[PDB]
Amino acid sequence: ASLTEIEHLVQSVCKSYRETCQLRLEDLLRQRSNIFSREEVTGYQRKSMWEMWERCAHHLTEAIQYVVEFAKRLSGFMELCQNDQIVLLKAGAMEVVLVRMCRAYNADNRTVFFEGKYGGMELFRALGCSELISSIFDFSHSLSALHFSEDEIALYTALVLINAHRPGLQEKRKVEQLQYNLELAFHHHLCKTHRQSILAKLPPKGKLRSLCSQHVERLQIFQHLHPIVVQAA
Numbered sequence: 001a002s003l004t005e006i007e008h009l010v011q012s013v014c015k016s017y018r019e020t021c022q023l024r025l026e027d028l029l030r031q032r033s034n035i036f037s038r039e040e041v042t043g044y045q046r047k048s049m050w051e052m053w054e055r056c057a058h059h060l061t062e063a064i065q066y067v068v069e070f071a072k073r074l075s076g077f078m079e080l081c082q083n084d085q086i087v088l089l090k091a092g093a094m095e096v097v098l099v100r101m102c103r104a105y106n107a108d109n110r111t112v113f114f115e116g117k118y119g120g121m122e123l124f125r126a127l128g129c130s131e132l133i134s135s136i137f138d139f140s141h142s143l144s145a146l147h148f149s150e151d152e153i154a155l156y157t158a159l160v161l162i163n164a165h166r167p168g169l170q171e172k173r174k175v176e177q178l179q180y181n182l183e184l185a186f187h188h189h190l191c192k193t194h195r196q197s198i199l200a201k202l203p204p205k206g207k208l209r210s211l212c213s214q215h216v217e218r219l220q221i222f223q224h225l226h227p228i229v230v231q232a233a
């Protein structure tokens, strides 16, 4: 692993992120003042859990599609067998969506960009999932305090996906090598940018993991009775 190779991996991972980040940072920021009105919030709260579930399902399905496209552009991911690609994505795609979410989160007023405007967590009341929604807002509140840059999100979410400890992998050594390469790139870039300090402030991978298991359990109990077909890209 030469300096030139490490830096090419850095630049490469950051390019794939730039091409598959669903929402441009500039828009998210300039729309921070565009907040749902009290009447609009009441409108979301009056919807049935079934309508709200299908709006969130569509929103999450779309975001997962971008995370999948992100993975496919990661050096070496496509050279993995189909089984390992699926294992990695099934275990990590929703964790990455939760990480990316902090870009759309405004720590000042505790609102998130959702269907065109910023709203607090009371927007999702109809789902009857206050505790879980609150946990998701707290998680992205923590990441916002770190001031995650776009390249830190790119490199960190690459490491969420490329994890040689996911059970079910058939080529563990090949994933281990990809993982260590990405760890090198991530650590090298933090040094270049003077951001060593965030390693210890990052959440433990078990925090993100537990958050997504509670997520998917409610996810399946919802889709068990209300399926939907979404678009592509």
Ligand SMILES: OC(c1ccc(-c2ccc(CN3CCN(Cc4ccncc4)CC3)cc2)c(F)c1)(C(F)(F)F)C(F)(F)F
Binding pocket: 021, 022, 023, 053, 056, 057, 059, 060, 063, 097, 100, 101, 102, 103, 104, 112, 113, 114, 124, 127, 129, 132, 133, 136, 214, 215, 216, 218, 219, 222
């Ligand atoms: O698990 C449940 C659940 C219900 C709703 C959300 C949910 C949906 C949307 C948002 C706002 N988004 C976050 C993702 N961000 C992606 C992104 C960000 C930045 N750049 C590119 C892409 C766009 C903004 C927040 C939360 C959820 F996460 C889980 C429940 F808890 F209710 F049970 C379910 F499904 F069962 F209903």
